[PDB]
Design a binder for this molecule. Structure first.
Ligand SMILES: [Cl-]
Ligand SMILES: [K+]
Lengths: 140, 140
């Protein structure tokens, strides 16, 4: 439903029901902890924004633009160790859209630190798709 | 409910609502990412199966048989670091049914790498129920 979807996000993020808010242009973001993107069906913690700040846009790269600037919500999720593990592997291929998305390789997972979105072809490894390091793949 | 249960699994697994499917005999598994077992009330990511592949059986040890083969969904969950922490501890005893279930000890958690199911009696430790190592308890 409508109010029930936010309560389910609240249980996963461990905040109160009143602290989750859908993204929508013009919505006041101050006073809330978690925002939910209805299109991508992903949730993110948001920083404490100045009172009255309203939402402008939320990209598929998890960049939230608002009336006081912007914030990379995927990058903020990384600092909070809040990750999404995509289906598939480096073997199957995948598309990385955000900074807090993980792709499983063999012994561990990796996030992409470079340009987004990141297309990973089938039969790939981290070494053959950019290498491991700053601006490339980082283990998680 | 019925459609609401899949939405609640989708939030925990970070997939879209339309990418979760109940397990049922004959259900088409292609195009979906997460399967939900109504009996055990557990969810598992599934591999990308060929178009038209249908489900056959799903055991309490998370063994999925389908029209194109079979897969240990519990082992796939381990490779994706998707675990279930059972209630109780080694001291209280428990029953391990899947490869992605964890039992808590005083120093940390462990998964069972051997034959399933695995019964743990009260007052047990990893050392007295098989030891620690390949084919026995593995720390997680
Ligand atoms: Cl690796
Ligand atoms: K939920």
């Amino acid at each position: 439903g409508s109010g029930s979807t936010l309560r389910e996000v609240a249980r996963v993020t461990n905040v109160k029901d009143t602290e989750v808010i859908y993204f929508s242009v013009g919505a006041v973001l101050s006073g809330y902890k978690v925002i939910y993107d209805k299109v991508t069906q992903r949730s993110y913690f948001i920083p404490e924004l100045p009172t009255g700040t309203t939402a402008v846009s939320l990209s598929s790269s998890a960049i939230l633009v608002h009336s006081a600037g912007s914030v990379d919500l995927g990058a903020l999720a990384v600092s909070r160790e809040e990750y999404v593990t995509l289906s598939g592997t480096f073997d199957s291929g995948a598309v990385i859209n955000t900074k807090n998305e993980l792709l499983t390789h063999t012994d561990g997972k990796y996030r992409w630190d470079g340009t987004l979105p990141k297309t990973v072809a089938a039969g790939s490894t981290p070494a053959t798709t950019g290498g491991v390091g700053s601006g490339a793949w980082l283990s998680v």
